[PDB]
Design a protein around this nucleic acid. Structure first.
Lengths: 260, 59, 134
RNA sequence: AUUCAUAAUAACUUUUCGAAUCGCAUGGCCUUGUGCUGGCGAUGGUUCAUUCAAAUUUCUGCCCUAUCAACUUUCGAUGGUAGGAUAGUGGCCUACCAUGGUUUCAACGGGUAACGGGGAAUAAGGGUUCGAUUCCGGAGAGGGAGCCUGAGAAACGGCUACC
RNA sequence: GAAACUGCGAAUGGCUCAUUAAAUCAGUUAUCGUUUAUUUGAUAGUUCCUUUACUACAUGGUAUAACUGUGGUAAUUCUAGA
């Protein structure tokens, strides 16, 4: 179509944004950035539809351009800057910190965090290569390039980024028996532990994951993110701790709150 | 015939109407950049060295 | 007799815009409705504001009358409310006056005539003057 | 899974890049200079990676028609070698060579009051009909062709020519 | 703060369904077969007109808009000369 598209029509935006049908014709199109647009949440959608701090786009823009909001320690005055999975956004006024993670229903939940853990983030190792002058580097899922990685770090490993100076702190190996998190497909938002990984040469390694309540599923290697060990994560989890309660199970509890 | 003439060491310019086409032929069959002689151009143009610089036709 | 009895619901303090935002529910039995100016002066004494930092809009009356639900904003100061309020709401409250402007079609036609001129136009003004003079 | 990433040697090159750019606040020091050293931006820039993409691409799946049975191939049809061109693979094109390739499991031709799909109507089940049209993909900007600029266009609220 | 240079955008959007029957398209693959402004993260101490030019880096020069003025054409977002 003669060049790249710049508009995102409503009903063609990712469903986890939960934009209402009738408010207009267009959705905020994420700009190019650290995360793929299908897997990103525009700052305007987060600040208006999630937090209700803004009432419309002009007030979103007025918030962003006065540098009250910063993502990964940088201001990002762009309305549709592509914030994405696990990114930590700091709103210094009101002294609030958020981690952008999906809830168990496949949509980004508002996840309140403290400053000490707002200071860091985790990156999934997407590539390991030798750069220029024969210098190895790793590439994370958010497009970060970290030179001089630990030689034990391999593909689909996890690293912890200091997020103030983008330097490696420690890594986690992809191995059996370790808590993982599915980041795509219909298992998006689930948290579990690796049971075993099946090879399937020629494409799409699969991994078997067991939930806390002993619910087992299998998923593609591309959509599996390591967050820590069993019962001890490196990220605070939102309400529900990734369990996927069944329909009648959610029914009786929701009546327990409201309908008694 | 109109003549838009400029003297550029002092930045002056003026228009003339030099009729009697039987003597305008010093400009005829001469291109831009070629030198004409002002002696036949007029009586007041004694010793001037006019270089052709441009012009506009009818239309 | 009147019993306006304003109630204020869903109040969040938003120092990002340096305001407070809320839904406002008015019970006005035996009355058509309450004016937005009256809402502003009521919330002025509710939040000890200056009555120009208070802005209200929305205000749909329910079927059958007696109750209306709308939106309210109480800013921290007058100038700070001026910086974030829309021009139409400020004109609605009188804090600002609508500017003098021709219609949108008039502006567009003027801009299209501006496109057809290169430069200031004083050169061509005098040239066409000396031409149409004869 | 690479003649991969890298790295080395020998040279080559209308020698690419390697900051003559801008705002704000302007501190600290010794050497009595208007000396030294100073922040935070901003713009720019070579490769790599990422992202938004694009291009090509594997397999399988389209309505009616035989009163369409053979089609393609001298004028590229099918394949090989080499070269040229391209961002790149490739008959994409060129030279030479071979005679191949499709087809009653319907090729090729003809028709469509055919853009395709998500879908719509009706429907016990199985089905039938519709889908120009709110989303996705494609194509076009009176009809053709050509091209500049640009990362990206064979663009038309760009240009050039013909009708 | 008009005008103008520079930069960026104008290839998005919107409209339509004429063409088009393995074509488009759909699901599913591939690039170990390529281009990719932009964003983001990294990344450049190596440069004696590209060597008798060690004849400025406390920082090279040239050439033009707008503008001033003289003009053409009935007419175009035409433009000539200085």
């Amino acid at each position: 179509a003669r060049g790249p598209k710049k508009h995102l029509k409503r009903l063609a935006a990712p469903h986890h944004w939960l934009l209402d049908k009738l408010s207009g014709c267009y959705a905020p199109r994420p700009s190019a950035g650290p995360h793929k647009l299908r897997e990103s949440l525009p700052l305007i959608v987060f600040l208006r539809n999630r937090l209700k701090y803004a009432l419309n786009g002009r007030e979103v823009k007025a918030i962003l351009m006065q540098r009250h909001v910063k993502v990964d320690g940088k201001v990002r005055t762009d309305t549709t800057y592509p914030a994405g999975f696990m990114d930590v956004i700091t709103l210094d006024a009101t002294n609030e910190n958020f981690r952008l993670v999906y809830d168990v229903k496949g949509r980004f939940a508002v996840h309140r965090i403290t400053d000490e853990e707002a200071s860091y983030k985790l990156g999934k190792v997407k590539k390991v290569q030798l750069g220029k002058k024969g210098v190895p580097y790793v590439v994370t899922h958010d497009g970060r390039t970290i030179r001089y990685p630990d030689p034990n770090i391999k593909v689909n490993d996890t690293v912890k980024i200091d997020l103030a100076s983008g330097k490696i702190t420690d890594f986690i190996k992809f191995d059996a028996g370790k808590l993982v998190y599915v980041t795509g497909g219909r298992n998006l938002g689930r948290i579990g532990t690796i049971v075993h990984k099946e090879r399937h040469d020629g494409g799409f390694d699969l991994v078997h994951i067991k939930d806390s309540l002993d619910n087992t599923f299998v998923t593609r290697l591309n959509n599996v993110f390591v967050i820590g060990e069993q019962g001890k994560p490196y990220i605070s989890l939102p309400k529900g701790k990734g369990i996927k309660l069944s329909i009648a199970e959610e029914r009786d509890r929701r009546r327990a709150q409201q309908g008694l | 015939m109109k003549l838009n003439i400029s003297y550029p060491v002092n930045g002056s310019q003026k228009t003339f109407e030099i009729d009697d086409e039987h003597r305008i032929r010093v400009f005829f069959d001469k291109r831009i950049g070629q030198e004409v002689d002002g002696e036949a151009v007029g009586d007041e143009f004694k010793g001037y060295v006019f270089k052709i610089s441009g012009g506009n036709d009818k239309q | 007799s009147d019993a306006v009895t304003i109630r204020t619901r869903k109040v969040i303090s938003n120092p990002l815009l340096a305001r407070k935002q809320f839904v406002v529910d008015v019970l006005h039995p035996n009355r058509a409705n309450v004016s937005k100016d009256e809402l502003r002066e009521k919330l002025a004494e509710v939040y000890k504001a200056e009555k120009d930092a208070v802005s209200v809009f929305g205000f749909r009356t329910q079927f059958g009358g007696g109750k209306s639900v709308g939106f309210g904003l109480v800013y921290n100061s007058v100038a700070e409310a001026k910086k974030f309020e829309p021009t139409y709401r400020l004109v609605r409250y009188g804090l600002a006056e609508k500017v003098e402007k021709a219609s949108r079609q008039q502006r567009k036609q003027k801009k299209n005539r501006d496109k057809k001129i290169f430069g200031t136009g004083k050169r061509l003004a005098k040239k066409v003057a000396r031409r149409n003079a004869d």
